[PDB]
Amino acid sequence: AKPSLNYHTKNLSELVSNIKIRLLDMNIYSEVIVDNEDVRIIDDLLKSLKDSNFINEEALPNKPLYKIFIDLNSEKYVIDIYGDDLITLYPWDSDVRKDYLSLKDIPNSFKLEPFCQYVFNK
């Protein structure tokens, strides 16, 4: 009935069904590799998403806190991490229309901003 708010996440979700993750700090522009043991964050996150997590396009602060590069076999996806549990999600080579999600209701374990701080402090 309506133009989907979850277009890119559904595609990623089908693809995440072997990934590598790269984290980029947007303040320092330092990069880290997510350990094998922690990589399950994406699957756990996607499985926990309800439809009400997907929101409309919003104006954005000048830059994310963090950038998550999800490297699948052929495809690459990007998740931008902002404040207040807001994130965007899109294929690496096409950001004309990003998915927008609020993550306030998802389980605490799968919140992405505290996840990113944790990978770096490790």
Side-chain angles (χ1 to χ4, degrees), residues 20-116:
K20 288 170 169 178
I21 299 171
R22 251 172 313 118
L23 296 190
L24 181 67
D25 190 319
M26 288 311 272
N27 172 281
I28 308 184
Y29 287 88
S30 51
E31 202 168 359
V32 291
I33 304 293
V34 169
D35 290 337
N36 160 242
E37 48 180 290
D38 293 322
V39 114
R40 58 169 291 159
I41 183 68
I42 301 319
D43 197 48
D44 290 343
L45 175 58
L46 297 188
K47 285 167 150 67
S48 78
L49 297 183
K50 307 154 160 70
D51 320 76
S52 53
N53 292 115
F54 298 93
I55 62 177
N56 295 279
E57 276 202 348
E58 287 189 353
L60 292 168
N62 217 279
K63 70 186 173 178
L65 298 180
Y66 301 105
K67 218 172 180 73
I68 302 184
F69 292 96
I70 303 169
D71 311 281
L72 307 109
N73 263 279
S74 48
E75 284 272 355
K76 168 155 99 178
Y77 276 65
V78 173
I79 310 174
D80 291 331
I81 310 305
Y82 301 84
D84 284 10
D85 286 328
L86 172 66
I87 73 167
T88 64
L89 194 161
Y90 55 96
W92 74 295
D93 64 334
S94 183
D95 68 347
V96 293
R97 174 228 165 273
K98 312 164 172 175
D99 275 21
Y100 293 73
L101 311 77
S102 174
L103 302 187
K104 279 143 187 313
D105 60 6
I106 73 149
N108 293 316
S109 283
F110 318 141
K111 299 286 200 82
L112 288 188
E113 182 184 355
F115 175 81
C116 290

